[PDB]
Amino acid sequence: EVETFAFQAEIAQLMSLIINTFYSNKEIFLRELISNSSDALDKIRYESLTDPSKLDSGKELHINLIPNKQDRTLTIVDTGIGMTKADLINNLGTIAKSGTKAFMEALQAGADISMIGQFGVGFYSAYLVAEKVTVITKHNDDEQYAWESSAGGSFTVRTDTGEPMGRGTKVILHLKEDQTEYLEERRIKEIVKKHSQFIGYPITLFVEK
Ligand SMILES: COc1ccc(Cl)cc1NC(N)=S
Numbered sequence: 756e757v758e759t760f761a762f763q764a765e766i767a768q769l770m771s772l773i774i775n776t777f778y779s780n781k782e783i784f785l786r787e788l789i790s791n792s793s794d795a796l797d798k799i800r801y802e803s804l805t806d807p808s809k810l811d812s813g814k815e816l817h818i819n820l821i822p823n824k825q826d827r828t829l830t831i832v833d834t835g836i837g838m839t840k841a842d843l844i845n846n847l848g849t850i851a852k853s854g855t856k857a858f859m860e861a862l863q864a865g866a867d868i869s870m871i872g873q874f875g876v877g878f879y880s881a882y883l884v885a886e887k888v889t890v891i892t893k894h895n896d897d898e899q900y901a902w903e904s905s906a907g908g909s910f911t912v913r914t915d916t917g918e919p920m921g922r923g924t925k926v927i928l929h930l931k932e933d934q935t936e937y938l939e940e941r942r943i944k945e946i947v948k949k950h951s952q953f954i955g956y957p958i959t960l961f962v963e964k
Pocket residue numbers: 762766842843844845847848851875876877878879890902
């Protein structure tokens with residue numbers, strides 16, 4: 756059972772800008788997604804200090820980067836706090852509305868796309884390199900969900916029947932045809948070393964068979 760939702764007009768406008776603006780420094784998408792993963796891991800770690808049972812869904816706190824050339828996907832997996840259905844539909848969109856407004860004002864003032872993360876909407880930098888983004892997520896207080904959007908103003912949410920994740924978030928980037936450099940081990944290593952060297956969780960770059 757698949758539910759389809761309209762983005763708020765402001766978020767749709769942000770995604771069109773990210774997809775249509777000429778901007779060569781696309782590699783920042785990975786810094787933004789790793790930063791999001793790190794924040795989600797910080798959140799479950801802090802919550803576990805006062806409620807250790809919050810880690811019953813998994814004690815390991817880590818980030819995995821998984822390229823797949825056959826499917827042309829780059830997957831960023833974290834075992835962070837995860838997202839509820841309400842997060843996916845309502846709460847994140849509310850935060851993203853004000854962040855988008857601010858980011859658009861800054862861009863017109865002369866900022867560039869690489870400061871997107873300062874405005875809380877760095878997730879959408881995924882559309883610099885992905886034609887479709889799928890997000891599988893599991894929060895301790897909710898079911899496992901799959902969120903998906905190819906932009907165009909709408910996204911879907913369904914209950915996920917895939918492999919149970921325990922807790923956390925999987926961002927699956929279905930890469931644009933001309934962005935397959937981000938499936939290359941040496942390219943991902945280069946980007947992580949440049950932008951994410953001090954993230955406080957182990958980042959494992961999987962290699963391909
Ligand atoms: C996975 O969904 C999101 C991820 C990041 C942000 Cl900032 C917002 C959303 N959601 C919306 N409904 S706009």
